[PDB]
Amino acid sequence: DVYTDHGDLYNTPVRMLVVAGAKFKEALKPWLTWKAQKGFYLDVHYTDEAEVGTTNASIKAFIHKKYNDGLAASAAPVFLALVGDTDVISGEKGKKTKKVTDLYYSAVDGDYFPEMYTFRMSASSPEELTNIIDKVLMYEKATMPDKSYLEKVLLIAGADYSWNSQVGQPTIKYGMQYYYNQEHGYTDVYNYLKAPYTGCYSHLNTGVSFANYTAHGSETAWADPLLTTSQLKALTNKDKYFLAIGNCCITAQFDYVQPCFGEVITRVKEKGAYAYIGSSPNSYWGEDYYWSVGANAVFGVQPTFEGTSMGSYDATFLEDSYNTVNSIMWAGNLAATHAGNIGNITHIGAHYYWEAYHVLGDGSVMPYRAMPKTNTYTLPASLPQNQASYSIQASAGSYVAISKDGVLYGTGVANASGVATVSMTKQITENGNYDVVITRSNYLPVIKQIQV
């Protein structure tokens, strides 16, 4: 089925292809430095490079060739980061959606399944790009002064006379029954299933790790309960950045005449989101229901975990896979595809969904699930020069990275016994202070330095 054939794309060593507008070279530096420090092998290119070009066709040909060349060397990019708005990386009109899509940058071979996890850091200025980066770095380096906002979520089944009872409430109730609850570490699960919605967006300010809205949308708003781009600019969640998902129409229509809701929620300074998942064209009630809960869900009936396939919520909470922002959207699209394949009621089709949904902001973030755990590690007093690998003790599954000045020298994943073989692609030949970073899904990062 679609789950066996097109599972989670995340793989190690992490490799990322970055295609960016030339005006963003300087602003990108801190984000690229941190991604290298945490173990990403980066291949960074700008549209002022003739090999890349500035057109939809040239950029796409460039990305497809980088993917195929990478694959040929068993070094395929895992992520594709598009940096800029449509004035620098246009996207193209969806064959099914008739609206802008980034799908065809990521879809290299003949089907509609992406080869890479693609996200767009959409900004109209270097300042707006830095706003996104600063939120991402605080979240991923876990430098926020109050981590307790991570134990809280906001879930809204918005207004619709026919579908709030049929799909909105069953979706949110499924999320709360199995995952967004005290058993999973969540202390505050703000949820609005029906009117009155009074005060539902105050929680965005007081602090949430995650905000999910399912109902009507517009290019610049969650329609009812209303949250406009003007209200997003007035948010006050300093040091409390979240992932937001709009399972609604057109909030991620990023070629719109005005910055769309997804663009504003990620671009706003020291408030809003570090990432947004939403749809460029209309989304449909049927497919959105499967997207969140899984296929085999029935309208107007609260779905069970055993009675449905894997949806976006289910994937999010698997401990060992689907641990990135992009993988949450990937799992949702898989469930909407599976529902069509097995003959559930569908309203639009799988191809349309793969063209529709987008990540705005940083899709490579690994979101925490309530309070992240403290990792266990042992770092040596020093690192001897000219070694093919180092053995570093860390909890099983931890990703260890050694770097200096934003240049990644080596990576390794801790084995079952808690030992990582850090394979050095660049051997340490000069004395100095080298960065050691240890990450693991739903664990606080370990950020240290070792002398050589």
Ligand SMILES: *CC(=O)[C@@H](N)CCCCN
């Ligand atoms: C966007 C909207 O008004 C509806 N046409 C679709 C909403 C689907 C919500 N999950």
Ligand SMILES: [Ca+2]
């Ligand atoms: Ca493909």
Ligand SMILES: [Ca+2]
């Ligand atoms: Ca735009």
Ligand code: NA
């Ligand atoms: Na509680």
Ligand code: NA
């Ligand atoms: Na499910």
Ligand code: NA
């Ligand atoms: Na997961």
Ligand code: NI
């Ligand atoms: Ni707590």
